[PDB]
Amino acid sequence: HHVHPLPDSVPESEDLFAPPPRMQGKEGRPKPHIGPNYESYVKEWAKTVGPNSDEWWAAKARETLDWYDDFKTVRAGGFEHGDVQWFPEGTLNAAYNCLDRHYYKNPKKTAIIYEADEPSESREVSYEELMQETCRVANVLKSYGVKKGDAVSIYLPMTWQAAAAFLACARIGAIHSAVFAGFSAESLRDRVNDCECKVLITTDEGRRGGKTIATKQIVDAALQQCPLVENVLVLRRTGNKVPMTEGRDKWWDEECAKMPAYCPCERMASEDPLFILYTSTGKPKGVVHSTAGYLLGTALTLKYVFDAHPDDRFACMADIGWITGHSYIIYGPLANGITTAVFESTPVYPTPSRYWDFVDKWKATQLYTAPTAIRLLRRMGEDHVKNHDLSSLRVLGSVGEPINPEAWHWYNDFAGKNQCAIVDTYWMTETGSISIAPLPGAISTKPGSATFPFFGMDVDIIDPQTGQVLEGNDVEGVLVARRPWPSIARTVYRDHKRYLETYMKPYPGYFFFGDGAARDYDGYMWIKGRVDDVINVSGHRLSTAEVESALILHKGVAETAVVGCADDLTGQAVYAFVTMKPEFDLKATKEADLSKELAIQVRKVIGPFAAPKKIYLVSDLPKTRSGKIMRRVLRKIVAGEGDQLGDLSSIADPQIVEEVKQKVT
Amino acid sequence: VHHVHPLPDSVPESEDLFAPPPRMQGKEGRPKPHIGPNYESYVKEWAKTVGPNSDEWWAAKARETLDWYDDFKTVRAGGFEHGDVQWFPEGTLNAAYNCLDRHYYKNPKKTAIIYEADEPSESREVSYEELMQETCRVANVLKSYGVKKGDAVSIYLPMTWQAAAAFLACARIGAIHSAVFAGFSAESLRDRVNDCECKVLITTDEGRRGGKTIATKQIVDAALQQCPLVENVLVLRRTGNKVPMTEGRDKWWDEECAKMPAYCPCERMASEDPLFILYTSTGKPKGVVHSTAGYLLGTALTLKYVFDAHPDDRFACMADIGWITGHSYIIYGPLANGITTAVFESTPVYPTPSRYWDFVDKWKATQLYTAPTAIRLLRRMGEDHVKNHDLSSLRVLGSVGEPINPEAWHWYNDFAGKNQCAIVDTYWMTETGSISIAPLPGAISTKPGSATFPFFGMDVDIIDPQTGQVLEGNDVEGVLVARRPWPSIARTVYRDHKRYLETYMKPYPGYFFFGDGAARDYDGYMWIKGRVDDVINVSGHRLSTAEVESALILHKGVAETAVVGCADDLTGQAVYAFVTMKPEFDLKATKEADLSKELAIQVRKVIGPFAAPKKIYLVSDLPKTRSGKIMRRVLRKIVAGEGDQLGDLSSIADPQIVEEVKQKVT
Amino acid sequence: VHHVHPLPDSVPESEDLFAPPPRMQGKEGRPKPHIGPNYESYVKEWAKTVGPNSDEWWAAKARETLDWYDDFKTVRAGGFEHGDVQWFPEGTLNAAYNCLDRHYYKNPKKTAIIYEADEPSESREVSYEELMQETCRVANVLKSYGVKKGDAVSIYLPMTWQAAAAFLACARIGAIHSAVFAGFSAESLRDRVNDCECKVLITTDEGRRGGKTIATKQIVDAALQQCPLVENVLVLRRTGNKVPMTEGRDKWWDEECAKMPAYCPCERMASEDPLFILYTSGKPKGVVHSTAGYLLGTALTLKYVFDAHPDDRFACMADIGWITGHSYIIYGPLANGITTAVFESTPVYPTPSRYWDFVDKWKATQLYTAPTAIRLLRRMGEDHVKNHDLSSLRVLGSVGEPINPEAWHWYNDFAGKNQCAIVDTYWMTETGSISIAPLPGAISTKPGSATFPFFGMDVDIIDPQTGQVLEGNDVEGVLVARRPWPSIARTVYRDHKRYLETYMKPYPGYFFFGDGAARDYDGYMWIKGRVDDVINVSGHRLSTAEVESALILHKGVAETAVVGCADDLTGQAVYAFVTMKPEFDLKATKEADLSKELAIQVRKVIGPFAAPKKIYLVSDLPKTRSGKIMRRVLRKIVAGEGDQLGDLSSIADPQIVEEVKQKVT
Numbered sequence A: 001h002h003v004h005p006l007p008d009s010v011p012e013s014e015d016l017f018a019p020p021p022r023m024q025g026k027e028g029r030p031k032p033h034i035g036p037n038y039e040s041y042v043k044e045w046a047k048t049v050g051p052n053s054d055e056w057w058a059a060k061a062r063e064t065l066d067w068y069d070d071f072k073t074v075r076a077g078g079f080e081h082g083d084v085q086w087f088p089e090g091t092l093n094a095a096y097n098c099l100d101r102h103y104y105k106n107p108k109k110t111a112i113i114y115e116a117d118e119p120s121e122s123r124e125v126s127y128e129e130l131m132q133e134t135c136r137v138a139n140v141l142k143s144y145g146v147k148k149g150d151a152v153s154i155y156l157p158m159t160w161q162a163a164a165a166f167l168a169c170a171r172i173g174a175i176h177s178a179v180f181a182g183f184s185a186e187s188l189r190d191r192v193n194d195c196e197c198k199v200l201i202t203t204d205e206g207r208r209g210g211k212t213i214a215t216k217q218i219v220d221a222a223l224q225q226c227p228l229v230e231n232v233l234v235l236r237r238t239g240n241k242v243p244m245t246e247g248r249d250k251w252w253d254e255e256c257a258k259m260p261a262y263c264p265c266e267r268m269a270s271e272d273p274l275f276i277l278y279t280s281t282g283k284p285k286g287v288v289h290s291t292a293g294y295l296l297g298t299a300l301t302l303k304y305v306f307d308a309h310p311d312d313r314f315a316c317m318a319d320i321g322w323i324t325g326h327s328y329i330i331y332g333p334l335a336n337g338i339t340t341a342v343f344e345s346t347p348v349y350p351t352p353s354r355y356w357d358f359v360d361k362w363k364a365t366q367l368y369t370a371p372t373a374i375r376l377l378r379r380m381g382e383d384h385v386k387n388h389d390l391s392s393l394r395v396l397g398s399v400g401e402p403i404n405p406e407a408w409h410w411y412n413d414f415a416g417k418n419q420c421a422i423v424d425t426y427w428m429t430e431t432g433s434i435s436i437a438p439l440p441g442a443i444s445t446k447p448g449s450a451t452f453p454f455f456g457m458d459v460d461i462i463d464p465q466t467g468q469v470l471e472g473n474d475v476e477g478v479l480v481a482r483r484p485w486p487s488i489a490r491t492v493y494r495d496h497k498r499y500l501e502t503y504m505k506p507y508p509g510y511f512f513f514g515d516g517a518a519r520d521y522d523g524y525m526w527i528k529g530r531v532d533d534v535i536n537v538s539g540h541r542l543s544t545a546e547v548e549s550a551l552i553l554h555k556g557v558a559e560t561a562v563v564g565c566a567d568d569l570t571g572q573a574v575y576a577f578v579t580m581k582p583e584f585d586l587k588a589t590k591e592a593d594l595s596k597e598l599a600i601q602v603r604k605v606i607g608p609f610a611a612p613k614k615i616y617l618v619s620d621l622p623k624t625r626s627g628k629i630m631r632r633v634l635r636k637i638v639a640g641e642g643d644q645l646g647d648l649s650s651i652a653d654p655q656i657v658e659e660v661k662q663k664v665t
Numbered sequence B: 001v002h003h004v005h006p007l008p009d010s011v012p013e014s015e016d017l018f019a020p021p022p023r024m025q026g027k028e029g030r031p032k033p034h035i036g037p038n039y040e041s042y043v044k045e046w047a048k049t050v051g052p053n054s055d056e057w058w059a060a061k062a063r064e065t066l067d068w069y070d071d072f073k074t075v076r077a078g079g080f081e082h083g084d085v086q087w088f089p090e091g092t093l094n095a096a097y098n099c100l101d102r103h104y105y106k107n108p109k110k111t112a113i114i115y116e117a118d119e120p121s122e123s124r125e126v127s128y129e130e131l132m133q134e135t136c137r138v139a140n141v142l143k144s145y146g147v148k149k150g151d152a153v154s155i156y157l158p159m160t161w162q163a164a165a166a167f168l169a170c171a172r173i174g175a176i177h178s179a180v181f182a183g184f185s186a187e188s189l190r191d192r193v194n195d196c197e198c199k200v201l202i203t204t205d206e207g208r209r210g211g212k213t214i215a216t217k218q219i220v221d222a223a224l225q226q227c228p229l230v231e232n233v234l235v236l237r238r239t240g241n242k243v244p245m246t247e248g249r250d251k252w253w254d255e256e257c258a259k260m261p262a263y264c265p266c267e268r269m270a271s272e273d274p275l276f277i278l279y280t281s282t283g284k285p286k287g288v289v290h291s292t293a294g295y296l297l298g299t300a301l302t303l304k305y306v307f308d309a310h311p312d313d314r315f316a317c318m319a320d321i322g323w324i325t326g327h328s329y330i331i332y333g334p335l336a337n338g339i340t341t342a343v344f345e346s347t348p349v350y351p352t353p354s355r356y357w358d359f360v361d362k363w364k365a366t367q368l369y370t371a372p373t374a375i376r377l378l379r380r381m382g383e384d385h386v387k388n389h390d391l392s393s394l395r396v397l398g399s400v401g402e403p404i405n406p407e408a409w410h411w412y413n414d415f416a417g418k419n420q421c422a423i424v425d426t427y428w429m430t431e432t433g434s435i436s437i438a439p440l441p442g443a444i445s446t447k448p449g450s451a452t453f454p455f456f457g458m459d460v461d462i463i464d465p466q467t468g469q470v471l472e473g474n475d476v477e478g479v480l481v482a483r484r485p486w487p488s489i490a491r492t493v494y495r496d497h498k499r500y501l502e503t504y505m506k507p508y509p510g511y512f513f514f515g516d517g518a519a520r521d522y523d524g525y526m527w528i529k530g531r532v533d534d535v536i537n538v539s540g541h542r543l544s545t546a547e548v549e550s551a552l553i554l555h556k557g558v559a560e561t562a563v564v565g566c567a568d569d570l571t572g573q574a575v576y577a578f579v580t581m582k583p584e585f586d587l588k589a590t591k592e593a594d595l596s597k598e599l600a601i602q603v604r605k606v607i608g609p610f611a612a613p614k615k616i617y618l619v620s621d622l623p624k625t626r627s628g629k630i631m632r633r634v635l636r637k638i639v640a641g642e643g644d645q646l647g648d649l650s651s652i653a654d655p656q657i658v659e660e661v662k663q664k665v666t
Numbered sequence C: 001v002h003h004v005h006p007l008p009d010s011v012p013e014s015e016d017l018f019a020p021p022p023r024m025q026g027k028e029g030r031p032k033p034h035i036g037p038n039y040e041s042y043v044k045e046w047a048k049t050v051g052p053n054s055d056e057w058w059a060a061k062a063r064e065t066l067d068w069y070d071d072f073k074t075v076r077a078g079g080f081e082h083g084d085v086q087w088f089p090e091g092t093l094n095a096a097y098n099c100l101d102r103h104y105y106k107n108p109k110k111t112a113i114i115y116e117a118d119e120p121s122e123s124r125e126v127s128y129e130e131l132m133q134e135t136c137r138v139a140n141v142l143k144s145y146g147v148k149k150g151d152a153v154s155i156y157l158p159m160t161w162q163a164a165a166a167f168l169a170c171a172r173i174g175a176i177h178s179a180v181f182a183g184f185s186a187e188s189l190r191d192r193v194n195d196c197e198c199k200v201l202i203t204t205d206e207g208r209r210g211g212k213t214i215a216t217k218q219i220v221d222a223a224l225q226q227c228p229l230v231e232n233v234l235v236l237r238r239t240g241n242k243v244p245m246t247e248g249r250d251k252w253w254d255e256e257c258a259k260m261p262a263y264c265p266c267e268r269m270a271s272e273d274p275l276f277i278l279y280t281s282g283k284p285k286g287v288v289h290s291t292a293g294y295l296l297g298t299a300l301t302l303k304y305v306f307d308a309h310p311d312d313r314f315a316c317m318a319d320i321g322w323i324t325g326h327s328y329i330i331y332g333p334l335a336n337g338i339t340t341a342v343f344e345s346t347p348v349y350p351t352p353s354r355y356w357d358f359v360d361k362w363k364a365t366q367l368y369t370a371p372t373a374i375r376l377l378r379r380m381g382e383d384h385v386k387n388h389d390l391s392s393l394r395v396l397g398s399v400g401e402p403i404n405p406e407a408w409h410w411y412n413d414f415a416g417k418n419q420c421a422i423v424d425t426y427w428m429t430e431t432g433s434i435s436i437a438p439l440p441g442a443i444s445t446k447p448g449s450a451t452f453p454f455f456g457m458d459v460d461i462i463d464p465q466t467g468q469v470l471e472g473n474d475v476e477g478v479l480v481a482r483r484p485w486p487s488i489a490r491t492v493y494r495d496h497k498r499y500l501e502t503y504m505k506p507y508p509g510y511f512f513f514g515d516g517a518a519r520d521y522d523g524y525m526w527i528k529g530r531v532d533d534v535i536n537v538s539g540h541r542l543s544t545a546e547v548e549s550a551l552i553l554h555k556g557v558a559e560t561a562v563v564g565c566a567d568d569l570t571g572q573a574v575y576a577f578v579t580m581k582p583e584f585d586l587k588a589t590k591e592a593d594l595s596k597e598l599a600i601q602v603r604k605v606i607g608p609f610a611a612p613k614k615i616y617l618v619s620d621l622p623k624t625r626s627g628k629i630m631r632r633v634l635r636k637i638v639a640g641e642g643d644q645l646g647d648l649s650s651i652a653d654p655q656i657v658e659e660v661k662q663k664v665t
């Protein structure tokens, strides 16, 4: 076979995992929405793509959302000019669909499980309380002169009121722009200026993992260079003394106490912008999502990819500064009317048992996190997870990067006790909602495979050299989409040329994701890393996931990243950055001996061309807060270009860049 | 042996029950009542409007009574505790469309407003067409000033018919009007203009009332020196006397409106978009906020049922639009129903005290609605001004704003109604939006001084004020509360929701607290006998202001009285009475010491030994607001020697009376 | 002995009636007319559109012809006396949705605009898709400037196809466009920009017309020195020649639109929201049209007066600065979903064959132009038209002034080859759409007669001295309308008093057009000139059209204008300005002899009272850019008031005023 699965210690013939009994409607669990096999998925999926799928999408849109005005046209526009339209004549409001309609049905149902940084401070927030708080904030924003179409910046940590802030903007038709709490003043400034908001919402301080985030201090530094911001609303999260500017800055509780606890919903066109979300090369990229298609995509993917039922308690452990928090903490779960988790802490605070204490306390029915969190808990030891119950879980999700089969198995074995479906969800900020993922009651999974495209997604593999679609199976190339889908990003804010050039020009007629992909002999899709991260060794194309998956098969390896660099003989050579577990004895095992064994492991599993030319042992890797490993930073450092690096002040650990610069020289 | 007594009356109780008269029975060609013919017909309909199955009735009434651009789905939600009351939330409508356009499309030449000018010879009818055209011109002017949906607009206008055009022009574009009584001082106007943060003010060059000039533009000029946000003033040329105009800021209404077309589209408003702010007559000005659909529905239904309004009716509410009574029962209620409404620019006694009745016979008014202060005023002026009029076009006479003493009630019944009209005593507040407790005139047999029974949608209880517990059964007295939200309840206090919750929702959690004392007699009739703050406690006996004042006016020659409490060592509190005799009363022939002695015995005979005033002060007038409320708080603080902590009293009806009362106490 | 005579013609009356030709009878492969085949078929349909039972017809047409977001309840209300005209008041719609989106959703690649560039080789077809995308980009740009619903936007654009996108971008967001003829002077532009109080102006670097450069940005910069409210100028790069650009205020159209997405939601407009202000050419008069009635009127008149069918290619050769361009280039044709021509050139550039080269190249099915253009081509000679095909044409239209029978016949003979119906369309900026015109499939035409009123128009003739309606036929007086019609102008911008005084006060209960009119014995209507231009000779009333029609019957006459002046004996005396063809030899032919024959011709055809007291031979006449002859200018010069003429800097050829002033003295 030309296309191989990601390296695993399990043989292939024992590596196919059918939907487990918890996903078969047994042991009292709800029956899956799609099942019980691959054919039930394909039969439904075929209704959602092609020239006869308008019927299905119109019905789903009218069944799933409450509309003030019906639409006439299902879809229009396209990639070439970036004029994508879905349900254009309809009107609706996102806050109405996420709060009001559920509040009118069951006001005391829990909307948010607020898991505070200190576990003892956690509590449930009802739909009634969340709707009231949202309306008070919306009334405060209107009193500042915020109109429909105005942008509002949000610099809030993971406290439950962050959802009220998002939905207050949606309620009045303002465009929220959320920035990770803890981003530097410089990074915050650039995003506040780019979206041209006149109002910013923040906290006095944030609390994450027992550490204080000095959010109001950062905000004051940033706003000295933000001439459009006239009002700042400050939530008193810690009560520690912070500066407040007379006139400009007001306390959230004091402002909201002035306002009634209901606010009318602005009637939004389907294509009115809902939010701007800046990704984390050059200027910040503000990805713009509209209202109806985005909301529909998040609601349908939540329902089908995680098999959400009305009583479920959905635990997405990500941050609302990330698209994962937008779609699968706030918009998806609340549109469906279920309970969603807002997790304020880290996976290891107070201890690495935190995730599993949370699951057993609240009886979470789904858990959703990133491979970086999974690898972190994998390296912390089985004592923190082995003696928990965790049987309320039916589905475990992974998002943000390829999941190494080694990490996949740890997730499957300890979090799921081999009784949960594992959904590896591939998508991007620009896709709005999950693009490729197994439907858990239908798809038999392979460790590290996203499996099959979601409803409305018609994806292909293109040879990057020819620009032509590769038909059949056992093919590898770059991932593209043939047709628009409801939740696709509509533009890059005030930079539509960047939007067309990045996604629509490389392969005209297609959407270009920017990731390498392979379709194996069974038709399963494998997303093996960024196209920019592919290493070309003597004409052999190497993906980062396969080498990193091979490296982590060696004992004591916690996390790795591989990058290419120009080589005189092979064009490019592989350089590995390897993080061993801190307990690994670097004196008993020689670094030169460990590097040799790692290279042989890569050679044994992939081939002679894949063996790293050099291996660097580092204590950690440069990562974004969402958990993405910044291989571009490592690649430029290896190239001796530690000067041409972009904005690195808001990465997870800025100091690790210094350690990497040292170890290379 | 009854714990609860009717307000003191010279008529014995056995002859003091007044069944709906023939004009309210569909006889003599009068329209058949909407509800009747008895108490049970009221309860039968009322029971559909409260309780857990009342959504059906309210949804049907909402869709039958108003024109909507978009239908609602949800009937009601929210509640008292957080102040998130919602009615018909997904619906959209426009108040101006419901008060003007839909009636104009059906009968453009029908009279919308009977404009009774200060001089009777200048009175005229204003058709729906003309009112709609003027409203649209003003709305276009406001839009040309940059007024947007949700912006507040202050209105400082006297009772000329264009005041209705100004209100409805704001409603038409979704602006929030804030009307201030014309004649309020520059200080009171300033405080309200600044609180609502408006950028536009609408006023007149001058007002005319009772042959006197109100220097409105002068007051406005003085106020705006401390109102830095107001950028545009639109000035109506009511008198044409020369007034200063500030270049740029001030423009003439007629010149601005001549530039604009006579139609303007209606802004499609959410049911819960704010319709207006109305500042009430203690501390900082309280801007009571009403939303759109529930408020409009409440005014339309109360006008229809409490006054038994029919399509050809000519409704004469004689109040001022600076008052909630003018908002609800001059402009929004009558015009929403598509009938004719009166805008009365004068006083009850100008040129003579026959003015009200000349008006009724001139225009054939079918209902008259006024305040007890006006009724007591006309009672004091003599029967020659009323006895020889016809007045037979009237079917219903209403009283609003304070308890009506049975003595005044009977005068109203006897001379205004010639014992052939139903008398509707309507209890409500600015915060309730529309009438809360009132007799339905074709159904309820009235008792002088009783509001009788709660209106549709109002589920009221009597609570022990200390324990918070409901007093079940009849013959109980305590404080009035409502159990559930109703469509027209005020939604907030502007930018001060904490004050709204603390005032109405926090004192008795789970209820709306009106602030008035109340009693339910053995027949179940409700008696609202005064504000809770005005109750006097003499030796453990709770005394209401209405009962003592009603006993005092039973004495011959008494025009009007007010009673307040003050600290007493032996009885806890003692009663002090301020008494206004008719000026024609001979105070030399009757000794003042004898008159006070006769008054005390009259009180003792009717109420009990404990109720006799410890001291009585004879005054030429009482401290009253413009709407006629007697300011007992002012009198109480003066008696307690707290004439330093009175507050803003510059815009009361007669500011000088405070000087006479302060002198007379010492 | 008829009191009312047809306009003077060289054809006897008995041979001057032209039934619909075979191309308008459904023969020779043409589509069957919407109304036909005779006068009774017109009356039968017309009678449904007027009177107290016509609501049914108008409600149905409104719902059949336009797409609505919200239905209306009331058909019509209001009236002339106070200027509160209302049509479909509760309805909501958007003009850009009706002219672009709904056609784009059906056939995106269909040509919306035939862009006939000033140079023929640069002409091209613009699809509905391309036009909608450019409209949406511009709308997004305007929104980014803070333009809100109800804001005025000035447009100073020449006849390039993006002018339609600029109009429709304003309509899309509910802004009120105010278009000013490109080439109007800085003073005339300044006055219109200041009157509408716009904060945004859209223009070009330069225009190109007849091979000449219009220095639009230079004119704009001079104007804006006296326009303190304008904050943003959007500049279309039409020529790329260097022009001044003011930092901050001025931005390039292509650079701004490249930042914006190619779709924009439609603002839901009430039927009576203003759609545009159009200043006519004392203080400038900004005529205001609302949305639904205006759009319905233009769509119905285009369909019925020009018998437009879905595949037709409609060629209106006027300028968008004129109401004719508003109604019959942009709004009418695009509302109907057909192809419309945007003609950037002049009728004689590069040569006088331009119109007919255009018709044969694009196979135009209808042609619409002004009598001044027809008279211009008539003077240029038959060689430029005689050898063209032109058989794709079915209907030829004339708009803007009376068409002399001599010019009518030239149009009929050479443009139409006696095989097209000629529609003489009478209307005004204030009427929105055609008022009186033959329906080409039903009405037999007379040269110079508008014939019969359009649907919804109930017109009468009033004796100006008595104010009374003249019943019956063979009557002459002033034209009035009895009832409002859907597309009537609703006000004069911020000058409603001028609106009432001009149109509604002279004859209370009627709309006063300002034109003299006669109804002949057959019931045909004749519009013979403005009331202000009527000449009173010894108590005999003379219209300009009849004398000007008689003068052009003389050989060598290209164009004439007749005006009155104070006379001691007759009250007023006739003065004629006559333009001979430039090839006419004024040395071989005595001017005194030519003047005598011209006077005798008038005496023979009209009578002794009409014979000009003086005749002036001029090389050209003072005309507006739309082609109206400025007889008010000529009258004041004859009266010796050549100083109090007012603003004449933006007329077609301002220098000709100097030549006329010389020749009179």
Ligand SMILES: C#CCOP(=O)(O)OC[C@H]1O[C@@H](n2cnc3c(N)ncnc32)[C@H](O)[C@@H]1O
Residues within 6 Å of the ligand: B280, B281, B324, B325, B399, B400, B401, B402, B403, B404, B425, B426, B427, B428, B429, B430, B431, B451, B514, B515, B516, B528, B529, B530, B531, B627
């Ligand atoms: C309505 C109105 C104007 O509203 P507002 O000015 O808010 O005054 C509200 C207060 O007026 C008093 N009041 C009003 N009507 C009555 C009545 N029929 N019987 C007894 N008291 C009455 C009470 O004290 C209310 O709380």
Ligand SMILES: C#CCOP(=O)(O)OC[C@H]1O[C@@H](n2cnc3c(N)ncnc32)[C@H](O)[C@@H]1O
Residues within 6 Å of the ligand: C280, C323, C324, C398, C399, C400, C401, C402, C403, C424, C425, C426, C427, C428, C429, C430, C450, C513, C514, C515, C527, C528, C529, C530, C626
């Ligand atoms: C249309 C248009 C442009 O509108 P506008 O530029 O407002 O000019 C309006 C005036 O033009 C004259 N006019 C226009 N068309 C004709 C015609 N077919 N026959 C006779 N006269 C006509 C009249 O005098 C109108 O009142």
